[PDB]
Amino acid sequence: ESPFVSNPGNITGARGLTGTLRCQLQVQGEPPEVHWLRDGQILELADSTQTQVPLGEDEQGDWIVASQLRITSLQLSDTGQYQCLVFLGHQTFVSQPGYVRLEGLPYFLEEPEDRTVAANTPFNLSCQAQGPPEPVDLLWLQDAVPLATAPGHGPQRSLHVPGLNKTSSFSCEAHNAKGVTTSRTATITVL
Amino acid sequence: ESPFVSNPGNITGARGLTGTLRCQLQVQGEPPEVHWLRDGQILELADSTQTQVPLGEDEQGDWIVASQLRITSLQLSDTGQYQCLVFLGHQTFVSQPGYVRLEGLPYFLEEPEDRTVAANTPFNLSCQAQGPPEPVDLLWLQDAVPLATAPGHGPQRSLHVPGLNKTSSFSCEAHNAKGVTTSRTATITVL
Amino acid sequence: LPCVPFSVAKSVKSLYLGRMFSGTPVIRLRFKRLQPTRLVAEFDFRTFDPEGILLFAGGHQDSTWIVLALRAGRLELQLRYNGVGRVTSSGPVINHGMWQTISVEELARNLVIKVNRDAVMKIAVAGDLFQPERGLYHLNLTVGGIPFHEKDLVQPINPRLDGCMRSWNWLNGEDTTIQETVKVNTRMQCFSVTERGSFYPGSGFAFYSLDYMTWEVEVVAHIRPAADTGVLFALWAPDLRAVPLSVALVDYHSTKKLKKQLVVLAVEHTALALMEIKVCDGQEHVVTVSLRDGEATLEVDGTRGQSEVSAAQLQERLAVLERHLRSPVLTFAGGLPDVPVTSAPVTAFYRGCMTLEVNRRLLDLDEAAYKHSDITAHSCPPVEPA
Amino acid sequence: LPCVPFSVAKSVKSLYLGRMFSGTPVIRLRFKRLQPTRLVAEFDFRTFDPEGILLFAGGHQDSTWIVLALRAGRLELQLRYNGVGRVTSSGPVINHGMWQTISVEELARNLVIKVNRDAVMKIAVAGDLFQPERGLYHLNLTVGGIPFHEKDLVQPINPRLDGCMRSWNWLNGEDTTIQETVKVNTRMQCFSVTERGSFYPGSGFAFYSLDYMTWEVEVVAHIRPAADTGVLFALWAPDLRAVPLSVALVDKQLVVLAVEHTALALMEIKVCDGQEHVVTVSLRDGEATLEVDGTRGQSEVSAAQLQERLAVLERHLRSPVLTFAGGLPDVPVTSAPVTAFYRGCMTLEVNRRLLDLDEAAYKHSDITAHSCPPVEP
Numbered sequence A, B: 001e002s003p004f005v006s007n008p009g010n011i012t013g014a015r016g017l018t019g020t021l022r023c024q025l026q027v028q029g030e031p032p033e034v035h036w037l038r039d040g041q042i043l044e045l046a047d048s049t050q051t052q053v054p055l056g057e058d059e060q061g062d063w064i065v066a067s068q069l070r071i072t073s074l075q076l077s078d079t080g081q082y083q084c085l086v087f088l089g090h091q092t093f094v095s096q097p098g099y100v101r102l103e104g105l106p107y108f109l110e111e112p113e114d115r116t117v118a119a120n121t122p123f124n125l126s127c128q129a130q131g132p133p134e135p136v137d138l139l140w141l142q143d144a145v146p147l148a149t150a151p152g153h154g155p156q157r158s159l160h161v162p163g164l165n166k167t168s169s170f171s172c173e174a175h176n177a178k179g180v181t182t183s184r185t186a187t188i189t190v191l
Numbered sequence C: 001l002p003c004v005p006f007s008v009a010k011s012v013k014s015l016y017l018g019r020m021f022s023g024t025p026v027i028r029l030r031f032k033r034l035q036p037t038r039l040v041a042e043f044d045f046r047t048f049d050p051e052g053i054l055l056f057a058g059g060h061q062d063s064t065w066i067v068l069a070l071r072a073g074r075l076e077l078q079l080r081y082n083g084v085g086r087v088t089s090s091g092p093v094i095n096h097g098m099w100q101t102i103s104v105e106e107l108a109r110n111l112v113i114k115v116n117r118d119a120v121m122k123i124a125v126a127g128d129l130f131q132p133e134r135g136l137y138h139l140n141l142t143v144g145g146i147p148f149h150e151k152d153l154v155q156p157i158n159p160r161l162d163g164c165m166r167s168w169n170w171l172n173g174e175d176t177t178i179q180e181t182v183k184v185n186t187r188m189q190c191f192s193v194t195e196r197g198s199f200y201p202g203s204g205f206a207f208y209s210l211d212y213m214t215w216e217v218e219v220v221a222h223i224r225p226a227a228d229t230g231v232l233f234a235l236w237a238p239d240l241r242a243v244p245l246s247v248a249l250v251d252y253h254s255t256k257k258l259k260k261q262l263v264v265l266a267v268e269h270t271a272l273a274l275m276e277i278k279v280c281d282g283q284e285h286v287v288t289v290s291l292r293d294g295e296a297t298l299e300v301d302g303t304r305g306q307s308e309v310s311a312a313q314l315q316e317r318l319a320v321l322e323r324h325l326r327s328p329v330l331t332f333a334g335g336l337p338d339v340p341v342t343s344a345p346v347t348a349f350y351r352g353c354m355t356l357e358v359n360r361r362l363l364d365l366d367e368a369a370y371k372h373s374d375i376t377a378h379s380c381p382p383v384e385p386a
Numbered sequence D: 001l002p003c004v005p006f007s008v009a010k011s012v013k014s015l016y017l018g019r020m021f022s023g024t025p026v027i028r029l030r031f032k033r034l035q036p037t038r039l040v041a042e043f044d045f046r047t048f049d050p051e052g053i054l055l056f057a058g059g060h061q062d063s064t065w066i067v068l069a070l071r072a073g074r075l076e077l078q079l080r081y082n083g084v085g086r087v088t089s090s091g092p093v094i095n096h097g098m099w100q101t102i103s104v105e106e107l108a109r110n111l112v113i114k115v116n117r118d119a120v121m122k123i124a125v126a127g128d129l130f131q132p133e134r135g136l137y138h139l140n141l142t143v144g145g146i147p148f149h150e151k152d153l154v155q156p157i158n159p160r161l162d163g164c165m166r167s168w169n170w171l172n173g174e175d176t177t178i179q180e181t182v183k184v185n186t187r188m189q190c191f192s193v194t195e196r197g198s199f200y201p202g203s204g205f206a207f208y209s210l211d212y213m214t215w216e217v218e219v220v221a222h223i224r225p226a227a228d229t230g231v232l233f234a235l236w237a238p239d240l241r242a243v244p245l246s247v248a249l250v251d252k253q254l255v256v257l258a259v260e261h262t263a264l265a266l267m268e269i270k271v272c273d274g275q276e277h278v279v280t281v282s283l284r285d286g287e288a289t290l291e292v293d294g295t296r297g298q299s300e301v302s303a304a305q306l307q308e309r310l311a312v313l314e315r316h317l318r319s320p321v322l323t324f325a326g327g328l329p330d331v332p333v334t335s336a337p338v339t340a341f342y343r344g345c346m347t348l349e350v351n352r353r354l355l356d357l358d359e360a361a362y363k364h365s366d367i368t369a370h371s372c373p374p375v376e377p
């Protein structure tokens, strides 16, 4: 057994989320500096707050040290295994790993674009969305009515219209396990 | 009968402060709109929020109706006498007044300026600050050495230096009832 | 005085949404702002109701606004943005009876709805809910219902929401007013603890306009009573004053642990079956009745009795039922109106938790024609343990 | 077993700054930030101690920092900024025994200090408390003391502060860690309720070294005892092991002024009622007078003994003597009438000068310098 008394939790959530990890420990006599490790490597430029509290009358008595790492905007590069590191004399202790994963609503890579057409004439609209998590099921709408019964059925990435005879609109919903994001509303102008 | 259940409180404070005033009341039937008065004038452009809570299942039953005026950044043009106003039929009702006034640490109108002078040359520095609260006592410092026993009972407003030989520095403290504010430190470079 | 006591504990720091059967909002806020302003609304929420309106925000009926609602136990957002209706439904289950944080915001060129700080809907929108008028920016907000008629939503819904709300934060205001007036009006507070059911406190009843026409009358009552007497389910001919069918609790028996209760299946004034039951032991029970010409059976926790009528009597009652049912009839739940005690054995109000399936269809008290106000539609308080 | 119970019930969500007589900070925070970052610190605070150190924020000893402190019951801010020091005091009286909000923040090119969300000090400053080093910005922050020696403050101060902190916000952090470790360390929680005075739980003593020089020994003790016997005040000679003078309680319930084992006066008190009694003494060759609540007690000596007991006392005062409060070291029980530790609330003036337990040569940790708990009804 080691000097760590609690281990970094996890933080999993969407891009831009701010969260913290913290490990705390107990040492004897003036405390060591606690470093953080992304994937077993020192983090050199990271928002952290160490908190030291002595338990005896003196600075020579036991101490409760505790570092908190701050991620302000959870971008994808922040992903992976985190753990604390303390050098105690001529010996190296490390905490249990915490994980930061990143997951959230779908994200559109393609959305239906406005178009103008003579119609009744064929045309196609696109709609692509990604996670994580996967898969992401698509659902089309024409004049804000769904066309199909649940995400996943029926038309998905490409929507073919035999052709309309009157200006209409078309939205796209993207569902995954976290929830739904809805696309711009394309307007298809007809002459 | 005067419908007001509670009249406006006060907000006495310093510039930049944000505060509210609220007045609530109880009325039979659909609740009227409540207007805020400063010094007898209805405020036509103010942050306000009206809350309305019905007390029966009926909307023709009683209602509790609050309003809170928000002052996002307190300043002198806000200083004055506030009260709520409502119309019930062709009869009007005014709340008891509440009061907003500015009060805090001294504000600097003029602080000691940087200068450059030859040795043993007479020159003058200035320091002007105002309340409220009045009076405002001043106290000069040369190289961080107070020029008098205590604030006010020293040299004030304008300081006459007979001349220097080394470069020196000058500050000036404004003390009033609420506390102290200290000027920028003025450097006087000598040649 | 009741054989089983239920908890009366309320939560001073809470807002009850289902207070008014009319569907009127339990709070109406009105915002005027100097700077342009994005809507933000957070609050904690807890319900079993699978359908109703959480809040409305925006302006005039047909103009531009949002309504956050529940439908099939999941969040539903409706929008009008210049005459373009649109509705989105998604996210996890909400009506699980457990507190959770819901939030709505105008973040960017989108609406974002979160459950427990974790986004469940991003709806693309171009436009602001706050509307300029007279050098200021206006927005109206209303909780637990809309300011306009439910037919003029993008999607009709039954706004009536038996749900509880706490720790609210409307546009980061610091107006402790709702909170205050809730303290002084216990009608506006919810049960500290809730459990699945519908509580009949026994001061009123509810009724429906149900058809039974060949004909069935099937009823399953899941009950956990407080009192030993009262009407579970009944039919009313408004014109004749009559009570074509009733299912009720009664008692008088004769040992220490005063048993003592019976369930009574009954046409008009004469019983058809009687079955002993132990309602006053805090356990749930299943009374269940199945009629159709020729047949009439009363089960209690999966147990039939055999009738109180010869079979000749049975037909000369079911023909009287058949008759009543050809005309329109009201389906009562939890009591009857004031009537002669000669027209039906029990006329009393029911006291306690009860659920009712009628003809294989689950009754929803929010859907009732009338529903007395103290009857909570989708939550029961728990049993007091002394 | 106490005759008067004192309501020693602590407060779990609080932080006692006076814990360590060493002056070691009760908390030390080390900040490392990626963006340039500006100091904000808010907390609620309550005390009767008129002197002490609330917090320190900055870097190296002679680099650039601030210290928020109490002197003569008022706020005082010391800044060093690039080796130039300045001290500033203003604002209302703070040590009135009532909770207030206090806050330090960097605002524009100023430092702003507020009591109850209302500003009492606005100090002009050139530059920032946070500082660059290896591509990050760094700041240290300590509570209840500084991380260097009181010597090297802009103006020296006795940092020991019998005060109570709660609802703290250090840089808008959310690190429930101080709060947790206070929960499991009752030595770090302060009395839920405080009253004026200094409390002795009977577990130890404090001592000073005071000159009594011709000579005199005036001692006034504002006592509210929790126990019928105990040493309030005493002198003591390290070499000869003697107790040249002592003032104690004993039972069935009376005060005693003594030299060595012989008592020079006696005077009764009903100490277990819970009222403030004023025990007062005066000594000087020829004279020895013990009063209590204004009333004098008659002596246990002729006058021929009194002169040849005062003769011994003055021989002891030409040597060095430790003045003790609230107890005595282990001594032969034949060396003084009472030797057990005092329990209760007490305030001592010696020679028309008030004793500050923070100014002692030694103080047992459980003695609280400027607060007593209330008596329990």
Ligand SMILES: *[C@@H]1O[C@H](CO)[C@@H](O[C@@H]2O[C@H](CO)[C@@H](O)[C@H](O)[C@H]2NC(C)=O)[C@H](O)[C@H]1NC(C)=O
Binding pocket: B030, C030, C058, C059, C060, C131, C138, C139, C140
């Ligand atoms: C906000 O709601 C208020 C009601 O609380 C609206 O006031 C009504 O508006 C109609 C027009 O739509 C007026 O003719 C009525 O006189 C008002 N009725 C009452 C009872 O005051 C108000 O228009 C709404 N404002 C916005 C921006 O939506």
Ligand SMILES: *[C@@H]1O[C@H](CO)[C@@H](O[C@@H]2O[C@H](CO)[C@@H](O)[C@H](O)[C@H]2NC(C)=O)[C@H](O)[C@H]1NC(C)=O
Binding pocket: A031, A032, A033, D028, D030, D058, D059, D060, D138, D139, D140
């Ligand atoms: C903040 O305080 C810490 C100690 O808690 C300082 O750390 C010491 O700094 C000196 C000078 O760099 C080193 O030689 C010591 O070995 C350090 N000790 C530890 C445990 O790290 C730190 O320098 C201070 N920093 C600031 C900006 O005040």
Ligand SMILES: [Ca+2]
Binding pocket: C049, C050, C051, C052, C158, C159, C160, C161, C162, C366
């Ligand atoms: Ca409902």
Ligand SMILES: [Ca+2]
Binding pocket: D049, D050, D051, D052, D158, D159, D160, D161, D162, D358
């Ligand atoms: Ca002190």
Ligand SMILES: [Cl-]
Binding pocket: C099
């Ligand atoms: Cl909870």
Ligand code: NI
Binding pocket: A150, A152, A153
């Ligand atoms: Ni499917």
Ligand code: NI
Binding pocket: B150, B151, B152, B153
């Ligand atoms: Ni003066």
